Design a protein around this ligand. Structure first.
Ligand SMILES: NCCCc1ccc(Cl)cc1
Ligand SMILES: NCCCc1ccc(Cl)cc1
Lengths: 169, 457
C-alpha cells in the first residue's frame, strides 16, 4: 500500500487545521484528539487505488519561521492554503511556493492551491483571482468550506493525483 | 431521605440533573472516584464547581484555567455569588444548613481562593472585578468562613504587590576567550560546554515564564498575540534567532576546513544540549542543519567525523514520524529539561479547532467541557516541566552575548534567508560547477576543547 506524505502550509488565522481535521475525522463525529497516531493518518481509495495519507499540519507553529524548511522537506506533496477573507494570506502564497521549490530543489513539485471559507469577515479574494494565480503556477485550485465539508476530499485527492502524475513522467 | 432544596424559581442551582443540563463520560476521575463531566449548562458547571457532596480540585483547576471561552470573568463572579446566597425552604433545617449551605459556601470560598491565587490576571485586567470580589469577601459572615476569608484577603494583598542551589553547580568552562573579554566571544572562542549551559539557562527561564493565559483560546495565533502571549513569543523568537545564528555562522565561514570546524562545534553544542535534556536547544540545531542553506553543503558534511554524523542523525530522527521519538524520550526523562514548545501549540490549536464549543441534547445547548479538559491536560503537562531549575551557574557576560544576538540585523526575513541561501550557493556551487577555494577568516586555533569537563567537581 503506497503512502503519500502531504504537508499543509499557509498563514495563521486561516483554518489549515480545519481542512486536515475535516479530512481525517469521520464526517458525522465532530471529535478529534491530535495526540494519537490515527489523528494524522488516513486510508483512502482514490481513482480505485487504495492508499495511505500522512498529513503534516504544523498549525500553531508559524512563529518558528526557521523550522519551515525542516517541516517542508518531509513532504512529497503540498497544499498551500489561504483564507478567502484574508487578502494577506493569499499574497503570501507566492512566498510559500518559492520556499517549497527551494527546499525540494525542484521547479516542478506536486502542489495544490486551496482557498478556505470558514466564518466572517466576508470574502476578499474572488475565486477568479485564485484560478489566475493557480494557472500562472501550473497547479490546481480547489475552494473549500471547513464547516460544511465541501471541497475537502477534492483538495487532498487532487494533490494525490498531482503526485501520481509527477511520479509517472 | 434526600434533602429538599428551595424552588428552582428562587434558586437556579436547585434544578435537578437531566439529559438536558448535564452529561458525563463513561470513565471515572483518576485517584478520586468522581464522575467526569462531559458537558453541561453553565449553571450546572457552577453547581458542580461548588458541589455539596464532595470537593473536586481537578474540576476547579480545569474550570478556572479554561472558563473564559464560555463565561466572562464578571459573569463567573456573579454566578458564584448567586450560588453562595442560598435561601431556606428544626430537623430538616439544621440538616440543610450543615449538609448543603455550609459545604457549598465553603466550596465557593475555595473557588475564590484558587481564582485569586492562580489566575490573578483576571483581576489585574479588570479592576472592577477585583472591587466586586473584595466587597463580596467583606460581606461573608460566619465563623466557619473566617479562616478562608482572612486567607483570601491575605492573598489579594500579596498579589497587589510588585538564586542559589542544592549543592555546587559545575565550574564554568573557558576556551580561548578569557573571562571579561566580551569583545572576543564567538561560536568557536567560547567553550562549547558553556555555550550549551548558558543557552540552556536562557531557554529554561524562557520556557518557565509562559503562562496558561498565553495559550488557552489559541490566543498566540490571533491578532492580539503580542498583547496576550508576550512570553511565548519572546521564547519562540529566541529559538528562531539561535537557529538563524547557527546557519549564519556556517554559511559565512567560506573556507571549507573552517566551515567543517564550525559545523562540528555546533554538533558538540547539540551533544551537551542532549546531556542537559534541552530539547529546545537540540531542535534549534536540527532546524539549522535541515535549513535549505546548510542541508545542501555536501562537501562540508562529507568531512564531519563519523561520530558526529551519528550524533546529528540521532537528533534529526527525534523529529521524524511526527516527533515519535522525541515524545517517547521526553516521557522517559526527569526534570530539569526544556521541552520543545511547538508540539503543545499545535495540540492546543487542533483541540480547540477540532471540537465543538457546545453539544446539543433535546434541543438544549450544553457547554462542551471535555474539550476544555483536553486543553487543561496539555497546559498541565507544560507546567510540570516548569518547576525544576537547572543546577548551573549563570555567567552574566556569556548570557548577555546570547540575549543580544541579532544575526538578521536590520534585514527583513525574505532578504535575510535569500542572503543565507545565496551565500550557500557561493561557497558550494551547484553541480557541475567546480568547488572554489576561499581564504581562512579565523586567526586562532580551530581545535575543539571537547565536551568533557576540564576539572574535577
Ligand atoms: N545527509 C545530509 C545531512 C544534512 C546536512 C547536515 C549538515 C551539513 Cl553541514 C550538511 C548537510
Ligand atoms: N533518517 C536519516 C535522515 C538523514 C538526515 C537528515 C537531516 C539531518 Cl540534519 C541529518 C541526517
Amino acid at each position: 500500500m503506497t503512502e503519500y506524505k502531504l504537508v499543509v502550509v499557509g498563514a495563521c488565522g486561516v483554518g489549515k487545521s480545519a481542512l486536515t481535521i475535516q479530512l481525517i475525522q469521520n464526517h458525522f463525529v465532530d471529535e478529534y484528539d491530535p495526540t494519537i497516531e490515527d489523528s494524522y493518518r488516513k486510508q483512502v481509495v482514490i481513482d480505485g487505488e487504495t492508499c495511505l495519507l500522512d498529513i503534516l499540519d504544523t498549525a500553531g507553529q508559524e512563529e518558528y519561521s526557521a523550522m519551515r524548511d525542516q517541516y517542508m522537506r518531509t513532504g512529497e506533496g503540498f497544499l498551500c492554503v489561504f483564507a478567502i477573507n484574508n487578502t494577506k494570506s493569499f499574497e503570501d502564497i507566492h512566498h510559500y511556493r518559492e520556499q517549497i521549490k527551494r527546499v525540494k530543489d525542484s521547479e516542478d513539485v506536486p502542489m495544490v492551491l486551496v482557498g478556505n471559507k470558514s466564518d466572517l469577515p466576508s470574502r476578499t479574494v474572488e475565486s477568479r483571482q485564485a484560478q489566475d494565480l493557480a494557472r500562472s503556477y501550473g497547479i490546481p485550485f480547489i475552494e473549500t468550506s471547513a464547516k460544511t465539508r465541501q471541497g475537502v476530499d477534492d483538495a487532498f485527492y487532487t494533490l494525490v493525483r498531482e503526485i501520481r502524475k509527477h511520479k509517472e513522467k | 431521605e434526600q434533602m429538599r432544596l428551595p424552588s428552582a424559581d428562587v434558586y437556579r442551582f436547585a434544578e435537578p440533573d437531566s439529559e438536558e443540563n448535564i452529561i458525563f463520560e463513561e470513565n471515572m476521575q483518576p485517584k478520586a472516584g468522581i464522575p467526569i463531566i462531559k458537558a453541561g449548562t453553565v449553571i450546572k458547571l457552577i453547581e458542580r464547581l461548588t458541589y455539596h457532596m464532595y470537593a473536586d480540585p481537578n474540576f476547579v483547576r480545569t474550570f478556572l484555567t479554561t472558563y473564559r471561552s464560555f463565561c466572562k470573568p464578571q459573569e463567573l463572579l456573579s454566578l458564584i455569588i448567586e450560588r453562595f446566597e442560598i435561601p431556606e425552604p428544626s430537623a430538616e433545617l439544621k440538616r440543610f444548613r450543615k449538609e448543603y449551605i455550609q459545604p457549598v459556601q465553603l466550596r465557593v470560598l475555595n473557588v475564590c481562593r484558587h481564582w485569586v491565587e492562580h489566575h490573578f490576571y483576571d483581576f489585574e485586567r479588570d479592576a472592577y472585578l477585583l472591587q466586586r470580589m473584595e466587597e463580596f469577601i467583606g460581606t461573608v459572615r460566619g465563623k466557619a468562613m473566617k479562616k478562608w476569608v482572612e486567607s483570601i484577603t491575605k492573598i489579594i494583598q500579596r498579589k497587589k504587590i510588585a538564586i542559589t542551589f542544592q549543592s555546587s553547580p559545575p565550574t564554568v568552562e573557558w576556551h580561548i576567550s578569557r573571562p571579561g573579554h566580551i569583545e572576543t566571544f564567538d561560536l568557536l572562542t567560547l567553550h562549547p560546554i558553556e555555550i550549551a549551559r548558558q543557552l540552556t539557562l536562557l531557554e529554561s527561564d524562557l520556557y518557565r515564564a509562559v503562562q496558561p493565559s498565553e495559550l488557552v483560546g489559541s490566543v498566540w495565533t490571533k491578532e492580539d498575540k503580542e498583547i496576550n502571549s508576550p512570553n511565548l513569543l519572546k521564547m519562540i523568537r529566541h529559538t528562531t534567532n539561535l537557529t538563524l545564528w547557527f546557519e549564519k555562522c556556517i554559511v559565512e565561514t567560506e573556507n571549507l576546513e573552517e566551515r567543517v570546524a564550525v559545523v562540528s562545534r555546533i554538533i558538540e553544542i547539540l551533544q551537551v544540549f542532549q546531556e542537559l535534556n534541552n530539547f529546545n536547544g537540540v531542535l534549534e540545531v536540527v532546524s539549522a542543519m535541515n535549513s535549505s542553506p546548510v542541508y545542501r553543503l555536501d562537501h562540508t558534511f562529507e568531512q564531519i567525523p563519523s561520530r558526529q554524523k551519528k550524533i546529528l542523525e540521532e537528533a534529526h530522527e527525534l523529529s521524524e514520524d511526527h516527533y515519535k521519538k522525541y515524545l517517547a524520550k521526553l516521557r522517559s526523562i526527569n526534570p530539569p529539561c526544556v521541552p520543545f514548545f511547538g508540539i503543545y501549540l499545535t495540540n492546543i490549536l487542533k483541540t480547540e479547532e477540532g471540537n465543538p464549543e457546545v453539544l446539543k441534547r433535546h434541543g438544549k445547548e450544553l457547554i462542551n467541557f471535555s474539550k476544555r479538559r483536553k486543553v487543561a491536560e496539555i497546559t498541565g503537562e507544560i507546567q510540570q516541566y516548569q518547576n525544576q531549575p537547572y543546577c548551573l551557574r549563570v555567567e552574566s557576560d556569556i548570557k548577555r552575548f546570547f540575549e543580544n544576538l541579532n544575526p538578521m540585523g536590520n534585514s527583513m526575513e525574505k532578504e535575510f534567508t535569500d542572503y543565507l541561501f545565496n551565500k550557500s550557493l557561493e561557497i558550494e556551487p551547484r553541480n557541475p560547477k567546480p568547488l572554489p577555494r576561499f581564504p581562512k577568516k579565523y586567526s586562532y586555533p580551530l581545535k575543539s576543547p571537547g565536551v568533557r569537563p576540564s576539572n574535577p567537581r
